[PDB]
């Protein structure tokens, strides 16, 4: 039985509005409704992994797991296995996988982050799951961010707290947050960003929706505008939205948006918005293709509609040679040439790098770089040809060209990372000096850049 080089992943997000679901929710897992929908001819083909995020979920874990498993069995005739389930308050993530993947899945982690302080601590936050699928690390975050049209900045803060504090993936990657720990990271949920148009324009917005004219609404979607201004979700992707706003509906129909201010809303308007979203971030030059992104039309127990997204995702096999794992493949090397970091910091410490990769036995610390001043104010840290030659565990190009090197630039004074990034080894050539580049982030914000040249030697 061959190991796969692709899998498909279903991501669902649904704010259930504290109501039990209806008896049939199969349209969700089939990617049927509005938007970028899945072809009917695929209906019986199971996804490899289903990741279900709920918010305002009133069910027990057992109750929801039974509904999910029965749904998938009805669609696919496959009895899915539970990889992980994690709940914080009424925010939940379930990961289900095909039974044939049971020995391909390992290192399963779960965590949660509670957002805000005192007043604001008590129902918002995130849950997450990570695991390895053969040689590929996968992370999944379901967040329910702060509500309210005038709280986009608080949502952005909630995002940064979640990506700082959610403890998933390989704890040895200590300088790296979740935005660098995974081959593929999916972040979804009731992100609660709104269409920022005047209250008076509510009926105009409804008209636009009825005409399926989303362009003048999406141009005011706070998540898109905040992302464009690099305020949130830097270096994440989202498929184009081609479905109607998924909030806020009258229950038991989808014919009416309930937007007007009510005691129950704290006298807030809920103009129709795309609260419910799926975003992703994959390491450079890894295959990831969104094959659906939409909302259901027939699940109406909540004031939100379910959102689905599906992805093709490249995966690699758990490589064994005669040499690695448990020794180097002396036929392999990675040389970082003429490298420099450009940092936005005002500090004057010396910096060193750490190179982290599952192709190394353990992370590698460089010598300190040479600080210079850039022409427009910047700190430039030069490493020259001083960087340590990296010795991968396996030299086979079919393995090595699929790997990635995470880079942290750390202060000598504090050992704190000032910037993190990632370099693909999917090069155009081996034994050839080639340009490399990554932006550097810290706490998911841009802090600088790393650029230079690489020379990769494989056994070919």
Q: Map residues 170-209 to x or -, x wherever contact with ligand WKP holds by CB under 6 A.
A: ----------------------------------------
Please give the C-alpha separations between residue 80 and each of 24, 52, 85, 95, 136, in angstroms, as whole numbers.
18, 13, 13, 10, 20
Q: Does 282 bind ligand WKP (CB under 6 A)?
A: no
- Nearest Cα to Cα of residue 96 among 68, 131, 135: 68
Pair of tokens at residue 304: 């939100």
Interface residue with ligand WKP, options 8, 55, 76, 87 (CB under 6 A): 87
Beta carbon of residue 95, minimum distance to ligand WKP (angstroms, whole number): 8
Q: How far is the CB of 396 from ligand WKP (least distance, A)?
A: 27
Q: How far apart, in Å, do the first and last CA atoms of the chain sit?
A: 27
Q: Which is nearer to ligand WKP, 105 or 381 (CB)?
A: 105
* Cβ distance to ligand WKP smaller for residue 189 or 397: 189
Contact 275, 192 (CB under 8 A): yes
Smaller CB separation from ligand WKP, 67 or 446: 446
**227 near ligand WKP, judged by CB under 6 A:** yes
Whether the upstream peptide bond of residue 100 has omega within 30° of 0, thus cis, is no
Q: Which of residues 109-138 bind ligand WKP (CB under 6 A)?
A: 112
Distances (CA, A) of 225 to 110, 195, 232, 276, 282: 31, 10, 10, 16, 22
| Neighbouring-strand partners of residue 292 | 310
Query: By CB under 6 A, is residue 59 in contact with ligand WKP?
Result: no
Query: Is 216 a binder of ligand WKP (CB under 6 A)?
Result: no
Q: How far is the CB of 119 from ligand WKP (least distance, A)?
A: 15
Per-residue tokens: 252: 């038991």
Q: To which H or E segment does residue 178 belong?
A: helix 178-181
Pattern 347-386, ligand WKP, x by CB under 6 A: ----------------------------------------
Tokens of 291: 């094959």
Out of 83, 178, 313, 407, the only residue in the binding site for ligand WKP (CB under 6 A) is: 83
Bridge partners for 185 per DSSP:
139, 281
CB 447 within 8 A of CB 429: no
217 binds ligand WKP per the rule CB under 6 A? no
Is the distance from CB of 246 to CB of 214 less than 8 angstroms? Answer: no
- Tell me which of 34, 42, 89, 242 binds ligand WKP, using CB under 6 A: 89
425 binds ligand WKP (CB under 6 A): no
Residue placing its CB nearer to ligand WKP in the complex, 153 or 252:
153
Site for ligand WKP in 427-446 (CB under 6 A): none
Tokens of 328: 């180097």
Among 23, 62, 171, 228, indicate the residue that binds ligand WKP (CB under 6 A): 228
CB of 84 to ligand WKP, least distance (A): 7
Number of residues that bind ligand WKP (CB under 6 A): 17
Find the part of the chain contacting ligand WKP (CB under 6 A) among 93-101, 197-205, 429-437, 448-456: 93-101
Segment contacting ligand WKP by CB under 6 A, of 27-35, 87-95, 280-288, 445-453: 87-95
Q: Does 99 bind ligand WKP (CB under 6 A)?
A: yes
The CA distance from 356 to 180, in Å, is: 11
Q: How far is the CB of 330 from ligand WKP (least distance, A)?
A: 34
The label of the residue with tokens 């972040």 reads: 187
**Cα 248 to Cα 173: distance, rounded to the nearest angstrom:** 40
What minimum distance in Å lies between the beta carbon of 118 and ligand WKP? 13
- CB 445, CB 389: distance < 8 Å: no
Residue 449 sits in the site that holds ligand WKP (CB under 6 A): no
Binding segment for ligand WKP among 18-26, 30-38, 221-229, 440-448 (CB under 6 A)?
221-229
CB closer to ligand WKP out of 88 and 436: 88
Binding segment for ligand WKP among 82-90, 176-184, 207-215, 387-395 (CB under 6 A)?
Answer: 82-90
Distance CA 35, CA 196 (A): 21
DSSP string, 283-343: -TT--EEEEEEEE-SS--SSSB--EEEEEEEE-------SS-SSS--TT-EEEEEEEEEEE
CB-count exposure of residue 457 (10 Å: 0-12, 13-18, 19+)? middle
Pair 305, 257: CB distance under 8 Å: no
Candidate residues 16, 88, 232, 275; the one interacting with ligand WKP per rule CB under 6 A? 88
Which of residues 6, 108, 252, 434 is near ligand WKP by CB under 6 A? 108
- Applying CB under 6 A, which residues contact ligand WKP? 81, 83, 86-89, 97, 99, 101-102, 105-106, 108, 112, 224, 227-228
């Amino acid at each position: 039985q061959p190991e796969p080089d692709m899998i498909t992943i279903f991501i669902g997000t649904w704010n259930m509005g504290n109501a039990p679901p209806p008896k049939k929710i199969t349209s969700w897992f089939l990617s049927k409704g509005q938007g970028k929908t899945r072809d009917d001819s695929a209906d019986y083909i199971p996804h490899d992994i289903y990741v279900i995020g709920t918010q305002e979920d009133p069910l027990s874990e057992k109750e929801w797991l039974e509904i999910l498993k029965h749904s998938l069995q009805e669609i696919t005739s496959v009895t899915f296995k539970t990889v992980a389930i994690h709940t914080l308050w009424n925010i939940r993530i379930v990961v289900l996988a095909k039974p044939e993947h049971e020995n391909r899945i390992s290192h399963i982690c779960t965590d949660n982050v509670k957002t805000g302080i005192a007043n604001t601590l008590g129902n918002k936050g995130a849950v997450g799951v990570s695991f390895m699928f053969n040689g590929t690390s996968l992370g999944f975050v379901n967040s329910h961010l702060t509500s309210g049209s005038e709280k986009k900045l608080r949502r952005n803060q909630n995002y940064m707290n979640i990506l700082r504090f959610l403890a998933l993936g390989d704890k040895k990657l200590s300088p790296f947050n979740i935005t660098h720990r995974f081959t593929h990271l999916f972040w979804f949920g009731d992100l609660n960003y709104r269409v920022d148009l005047p209250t008076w324009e509510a009926e105009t917005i409804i008209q636009k929706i009825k005409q399926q004219q989303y362009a003048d609404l999406l141009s005011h979607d706070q998540l898109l505008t905040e992302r464009r201004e690099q305020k949130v979700f830097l270096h994440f992707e989202e498929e184009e939205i081609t479905f109607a706003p998924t909030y806020r509906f009258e229950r038991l129909t989808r014919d009416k948006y309930a937007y007007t201010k009510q005691k129950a809303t704290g006298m807030k308007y809920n103009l129709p918005s795309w609260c419910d979203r799926v975003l992703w971030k994959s390491y450079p030059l890894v295959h990831v293709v969104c094959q659906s992104y939409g909302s259901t039309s027939d699940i109406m127990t909540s004031d939100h509609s379910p959102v689905f997204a599906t992805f093709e995702a490249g995966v690699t096999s758990q490589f064994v040679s005669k040499n690695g794992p448990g020794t180097v493949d002396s036929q392999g090397q990675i040389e970082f040439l003429r490298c420099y970091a450009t940092l936005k910091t005002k500090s004057q410490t010396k910096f060193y790098l750490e190179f982290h990769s599952s192709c190394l036995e353990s992370f590698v610390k460089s010598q300190e770089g040479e600080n210079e001043e850039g022409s427009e104010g910047e700190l430039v840290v030069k490493f020259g040809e001083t960087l340590p030659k990296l010795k991968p565990i396996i030299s086979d190009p079919e393995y090595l060209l699929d790997q990635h090197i995470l880079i942290s630039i750390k202060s000598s004074d504090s050992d704190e990372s000032y910037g993190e990034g990632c370099i693909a080894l999917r090069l155009e050539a081996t034994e050839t000096q080639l340009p490399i580049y990554t932006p550097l982030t810290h706490h998911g914000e841009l802090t600088g850049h790393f650029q230079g040249e690489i020379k990769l030697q494989t056994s070919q």
